[PDB]
Amino acid sequence: DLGGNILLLSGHPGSGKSTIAEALANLPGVPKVHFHSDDLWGYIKHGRIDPWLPQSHQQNRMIMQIAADVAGRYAKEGYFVILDGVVRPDWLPAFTALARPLHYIVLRTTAAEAIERCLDRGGDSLSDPLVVADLHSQFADLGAFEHHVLPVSGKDTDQALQSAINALQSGRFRID
Amino acid sequence: DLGGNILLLSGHPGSGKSTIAEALANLPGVPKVHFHSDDLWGYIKHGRIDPWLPQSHQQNRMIMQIAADVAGRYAKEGYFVILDGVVRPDWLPAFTALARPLHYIVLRTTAAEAIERCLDRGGDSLSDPLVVADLHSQFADLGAFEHHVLPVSGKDTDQALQSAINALQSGRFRID
Enumerate the residues of chain A whose CB falls inside 8 A of the CB of residue B46.
25-32
A41 interfaces chain B, CB cutoff of 8 Å: no
Distance in angstroms (rounded) separating the CA atoms of residues A82 and A71: 8
Question: To 5 degrees, how large is the angle CA B149–CA B88–CA B159?
Answer: 30
Which residue, B114, B56, B79, is CA-closest to B6? B79
- Residues whose CB falls within 8 Å of the CB of residue B48, separated by 6 or more in sequence, listed in order: B41
- Residues whose CB falls within 8 Å of the CB of residue A53, separated by 6 or more in sequence, listed in order: none
Residues B14 and B114 sit within 8 Å (Cβ to Cβ): yes
Distance in angstroms (rounded) separating the CA atoms of residues A13 and A90: 18
Question: To 5 degrees, how large is the angle CA A64–CA A67–CA A68?
Answer: 85
Distance in angstroms (rounded) separating the CA atoms of residues A62 and A68: 10
Residues A164 and A138 sit within 8 Å (Cβ to Cβ): no
Question: Which amino acid, residue A27?
Answer: L
Enumerate the residues of chain B whose CB falls inside 8 A of the CB of residue A34.
43, 45
Structural domain tally of chain A?
1
Torsion sign, CA atoms A117, A123, A125, A130: positive
Q: Pick the residue of B44, B57, B76 with the most A CBs within 10 A to test the interface with A by mutation.
A: B44
Enumerate the residues of chain A whose CB falls inside 8 A of the CB of residue B32.
44-47
Which residues, listed in sequence order, are joined to residue B11 by a DSSP beta bridge? B107
CA distances from A21 to A26, A160, B125, B127, B149 (A): 8, 11, 21, 26, 40
Distance in angstroms (rounded) separating the CA atoms of residues A33 and B47: 9
Enumerate the residues of chain B whose CB falls inside 8 A of the CB of residue A73.
62, 65-66, 69
CA-based nearest residue in chain B for residue A41: B33
Side-chain-side CA neighbours of A133 within 13 Å: the count stands at 8
Side-chain-side CA neighbours of A161 within 13 Å: the count stands at 14
Measure CB to CB from residue A77 to each of B25, B45, B62 and give the nearest one.
Answer: B62
CA B44, B47, B52, B55: dihedral to nearest 10 degrees? -130
Phi, psi dihedrals of residue A16, rounded to the nearest 5° = 75, 40
**Nearest chain A CA: its distance from B104 CA (Å):** 19
Residues A72 and A49 sit within 8 Å (Cβ to Cβ): no
Question: Is there a contact between A43 and B36 if contact means CB atoms under 8 Å apart?
Answer: yes
User: By three-state DSSP, how is residue B70 classified?
Assistant: helix
Residues A149 and A108 sit within 8 Å (Cβ to Cβ): yes
Domain of B115: which CATH number?
Answer: 3.40.50.300
User: By three-state DSSP, how is residue B123 classified?
Assistant: coil
Method by which the coordinates were obtained: X-ray
Distance in angstroms (rounded) separating the CA atoms of residues A160 and A169: 13
Distance in angstroms (rounded) separating the CA atoms of residues B11 and B118: 13
Residue A169: which domain range? 1-176
